[PDB]
Amino acid sequence: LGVAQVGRMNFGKDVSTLKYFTICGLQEGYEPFAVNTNRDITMWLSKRLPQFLQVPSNHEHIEVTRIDGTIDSSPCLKVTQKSFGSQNSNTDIMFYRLSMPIECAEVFSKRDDYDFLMQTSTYYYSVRIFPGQEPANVWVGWITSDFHQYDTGFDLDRVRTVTVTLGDEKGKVHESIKRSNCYMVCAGESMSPGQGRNNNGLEIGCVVDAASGLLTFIANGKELSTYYQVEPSTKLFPAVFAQATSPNVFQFELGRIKNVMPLSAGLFKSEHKNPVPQCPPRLHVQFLSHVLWSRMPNQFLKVDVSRISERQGWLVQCLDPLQFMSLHIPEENRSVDILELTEQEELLKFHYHTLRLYSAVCALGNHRVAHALCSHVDEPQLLYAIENKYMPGLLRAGYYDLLIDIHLSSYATARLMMNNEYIVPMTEETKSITLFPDENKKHGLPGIGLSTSLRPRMQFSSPSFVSISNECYQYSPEFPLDILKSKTIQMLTEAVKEGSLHARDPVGGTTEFLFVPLIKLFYTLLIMGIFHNEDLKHILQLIEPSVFKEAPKEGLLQMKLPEPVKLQMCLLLQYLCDCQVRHRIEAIVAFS
Amino acid sequence: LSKKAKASTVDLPIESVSLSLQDLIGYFHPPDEHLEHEDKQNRLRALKNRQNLFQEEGMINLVLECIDRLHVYSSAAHFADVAGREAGESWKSILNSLYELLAALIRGNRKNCAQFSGSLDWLISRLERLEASSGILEVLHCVLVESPEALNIIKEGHIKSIISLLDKHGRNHKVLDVLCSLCVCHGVAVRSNQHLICDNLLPGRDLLLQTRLVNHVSSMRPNIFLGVSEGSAQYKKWYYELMVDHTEPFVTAEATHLRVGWASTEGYSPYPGGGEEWGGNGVGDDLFSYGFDGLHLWSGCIARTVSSPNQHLLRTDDVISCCLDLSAPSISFRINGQPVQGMFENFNIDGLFFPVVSFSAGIKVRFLLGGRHGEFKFLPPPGYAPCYEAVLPKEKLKVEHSREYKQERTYTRDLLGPTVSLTQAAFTPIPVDT
Amino acid sequence: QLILLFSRTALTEKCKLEEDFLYMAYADIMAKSCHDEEVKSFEEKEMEKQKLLYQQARLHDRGAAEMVLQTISASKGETGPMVAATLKLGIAILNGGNSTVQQKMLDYLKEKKDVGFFQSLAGLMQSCSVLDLNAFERQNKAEGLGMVTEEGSGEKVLQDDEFTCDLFRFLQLLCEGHNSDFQNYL
Amino acid sequence: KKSSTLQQLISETMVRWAQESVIEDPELVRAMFVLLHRQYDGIGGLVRALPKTYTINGVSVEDTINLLASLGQIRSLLSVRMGKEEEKLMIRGLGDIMNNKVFYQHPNLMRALGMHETVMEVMVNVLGGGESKEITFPKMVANCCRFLCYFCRISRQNQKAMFDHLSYLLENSSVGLASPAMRGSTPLDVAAASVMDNNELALALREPDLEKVVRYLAGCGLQSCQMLVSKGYPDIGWNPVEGERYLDFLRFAVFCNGESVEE
Amino acid sequence: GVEIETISPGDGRTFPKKGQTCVVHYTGMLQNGKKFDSSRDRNKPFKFRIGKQEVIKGFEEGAAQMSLGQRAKLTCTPDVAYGATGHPGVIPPNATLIFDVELLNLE
């Protein structure tokens, strides 16, 4: 769509809405794009706001060289333009930043000495403008994550800023705080002596004091008048903005100076006390670009706006809750919707393996680790992950497994490991048991009935991290089992009809992703025995309506399912037979 | 070469070693999956016999000696300086081939992996090196998967190095797989390893991606686009009020969002600038917006507590009056007629400002824009003009979504392209010089 | 499909033949299905021979003759219930000197050049038990002293008399009918 | 039409799947045919279930529940590697189970639950862990051996059940004989208690088993004690401390109830 | 100790006494702003007794100064909460915890 252009796309989810399909498109055999879909198609648009991403290895303007630091030379990152001089070269300002931020202290305090370096919190990096790149086109300093400004003409006056001034009741300003996303200086004005670049390329030094939030710049060994004071807990990204008038633009020197701790100490926690400068592979140059997609939400907030009257003004009313689960990248201080991982493969893979690690650390009755993991993966996030239809299949399976391992696996295993034993007490309830429900020799529904055999005890502990008592660690964390039961029943009921239509858009992308996790959760709940009476009757009808009719829909057994789902159905049918065997044993004891 | 020696007198079989390593890898290549079951079993049996013969003849220690002898040189350039240009060129390839050969020799064999338990400690000592990280990690993965005994050697000092590999080298799912294999092997869980991995990786919240449920937040703004510029007929003071008819503190597990204030546009476009469209961000979550939640002053996604008589989060029946003065950049707020002891100052004025409210589910708010549209409960501060006076003559004041996309049917959704710059907001009279 | 699963399990490389209840049950079922068991007429005997031939064909046309050899070879000379069931199945499919089954087994052995089959056959013979007079005397003294032995049949003496008979009946059926080729191959 | 029975439904369904498609998953094929065999052999389910069925009075329900919970806690230790924290759990569970009255009142339910295998397998996993490295976590092994000795002493049938696992305990019998204060708490002690004062089991005892013990005794008479010489004891050619234990086991094997077993 | 900043006013007269159970909803947040605990997520009120050392002393002293129906922000310094060892797996060593606490009922 161009400037001031309005358009609409109809994917033909409802065939009646297509205006010209019948006159041209129906007879020729052509099909609507969303003809066999139950849920709305997700549309992705071009992002308006640029973001910082690592320079591609195949970029046709920017080239990045990683120079390993020798004993006498600091590690360097070198930025060059490959297409300079030739036609189609980029004359616009390019914004560069480092991938890792420096963390200012939460509460501001108020031979180089090894002890001084160990106790200091001041870090340093230097930028060498190569002789030939005009310093008036190069700016050096720090930026925050909020910086998303892409202007062809950049100036230090145009940077966004605000001055929050708090005062007392009388009105005197007892503190004034300046806030900005950009804290950078210009090399042209920084070259105070003049001719300093000619003999040797300018080495602009950036010094940050994480304990005080003071940003000081040193050019050619003299401290420039320009300085900044940032708020506590501010995250500062090293950044260099440069318009290239040369094939070689500048360099990122990761060295250190007298009494100043190297930057790799402030970036990485493992090297907090290592004076030797380092450039680990995580650190890499990123640039601001517009090549990103954005995922339009399937549902928006329902807001009603109307003018009540002459006096009452305009009314804005929102009353229904809508939520989304957000993925936070710790290093970049960014947060994205987890449903955006359908197009980000590396993040999807890493998060799926993280979920597997979560399920593995608490495996086999590690109740303390399960309690700890309840802090990272919460009950509402698990429930939303279970319910959501647009979630990627890998994340769906991972979250199902995480829920099962954290809350249900312990008791499920406890009941399974005591399954082929039958210790039945000698009580009147046992005596009342009979093989057949009535005079007619008609088998009752499996599972439904009176079972008196001794069974393990279900116990759970409430996960709280404000209680000093350690007796909570035993027993797995508590979960809303009734809510989970109702959700599982509802979603199985929906999936039975959804799959039978053979829609092209199953939940999770495939029939396996749709069914295997959900049937696995159902099997776990059945094994633990939460299902009682009417719920078991309804789910047996779902499994097979005709056979389990109490005395047109096709149950799971007759839907032509994939092999992984067939295996789970086999497990369910095994459990039903085990229930029948237990009922027979109890009736035998009753007769005895 | 290590003993001081004259270079050309040393005969270093670089090409022969490379070709032999290439042949040995093919000699230990695992069977292909599409092969028939019987053929695959035969190839697996032959591979196992080859591995057993090699381990019995001690070909693992020879590879280990070669690897250790090659790691004395830090880099390919250093090795080239010591030996020669071709040796420096082939150094990295020889190291990778040696590590692949070791992995192929120990893969799938439990006895070899059990014999590698002693050398496990020596292997993890170079995991940090970028020259051999992938091969060392693959060998570690094979040993940990195939040998139950191997897990008993792994200690805290070995687990923390693997964890710090994630921090130094970035996100890599193979490290996660190795950490998973450490916890459970052959259905047996190592609780010490589980506890160590949890206590050393989870509390940091700095490597693994984090998750949380965030309420959706939407913004409403009036039609008015007011700004300040030289040689313009725009009044520089404005005033409007917001009334909270009803609010629910917790409609969900997270607290209800309700912020009011002013926001600006990047340039002269009618599109709000610097902020994302759909998500959990509202007034004051960017450097283009300025908010007040009743207890804090929001700007740039940092909140500072501001004092007021009887401070409270915005409740039912609260009147918030907002003042904007563009002559000297200043945004001030007054709650229920009392003054809020704080204000925004000296912000960028190269744009157009408009009233804005951000909220989540569970609100009922009202714009008192003054005049015909609204009735002010409190008398505007002297000098400030009410916001209804900025409406253009032919336009009608209304409250619409700040962002262009709202909730509606898919096929009825109006997709919008870029909008033309709204320069008509500032009427700058420029007669032709004569 | 069941026969192919059981054959693939045997062909899978393992240090020891793990006991499989599914195999031990279905091998017994398949062995009983073959046999399904005053002068009788010649027509009746001919009918009973043709019925046995059909019931054996229904299994050796699906690969049971190549299964029973594979399981014995994978046994590696260790006597067990799996080997006993395999021998019973082989006897069931080989009853009457079934020339087709004999030819299939000989052809399979020749084309696979299997040495493990004969090595396991030798190992089973070495592991076969005989009369144990010491065990007999110990059981007699235990019964005489007054306590009754848990087993009244004295099964400890002559540990497995059915396994040995089945193992040698299998080898006799393999050569029945003067099958000179397999006689020389043995 | 309607099958009207779960057995018929499964029997039809599984054959239908197999004849419709060639299943590539061996796990699916195995589960399919296991289920079909279970449906067809209904009586086998009872044949397997009835030996695992026990009947208790109503007054013992709570005690049985506590005993079953302790058994579950001990059984769950099989899926985790041995450690200091698991040692306390194992010891506490064993102590509770011996204090519980059902342990004494119902030895048949004891043997059906079959902890005499679970304790053995836990103990031998520990013994195999660091075998050449000599036994670690010795106190749990002592507790397990004492529990097994008590289990043998409870009933004669329990002693016979323990006698089945006699040979294996005697390969795992050189563990803590040299270690003092371990007396009566070794797998050799468990083996001795398995054949202590029972004519039937003494007669059922075999010759190679005695040959193995005689070989251990000859080795102990030929070689010194590595642990003692490492602790600094004066080196002698032979090992009295190790030898006496095997001598006592042979004494229990050959002499029973005042009389002497000639065989 | 702990600061108390009032988010919502309470009755201002009914305070917890010794030997009385406090029913509260709390939300645990680290200084960087990352949530680590919330009773509202589990949808169950949290009950504890005053003076019995059932909770961290920072939480206890912060909730002791509150009134019935009051919603306040409790900032617990790393000395009143989990010291320097931290809570294994959840709370990093030497961490400051911010709590949003509402006193539901005193019973």
Side-chain angles (χ1 to χ4, degrees), chain A residues 87 208 466 587:
Chain A
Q87 188 60 50
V208 56
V466 300

Side-chain angles (χ1 to χ4, degrees), chain D residues 233-250:
Chain D
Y233 273 99
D235 181 86
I236 302 299
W238 63 292
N239 200 342
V241 177
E242 275 286 332
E244 191 267 341
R245 305 291 290 161
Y246 301 108
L247 278 167
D248 267 18
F249 175 77
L250 297 165

Side-chain angles (χ1 to χ4, degrees), chain A residues 365-376:
Chain A
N366 213 340
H367 295 149
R368 190 195 78 81
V369 175
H371 271 88
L373 278 162
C374 291
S375 179
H376 303 264

Side-chain angles (χ1 to χ4, degrees), chain A residues 5-23:
Chain A
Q5 293 312 306
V6 189
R8 304 193 179 112
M9 279 169 28
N10 200 337
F11 290 134
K13 184 178 185 293
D14 188 22
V15 187
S16 86
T17 60
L18 286 183
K19 293 181 175 66
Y20 294 107
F21 188 50
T22 53
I23 74 154

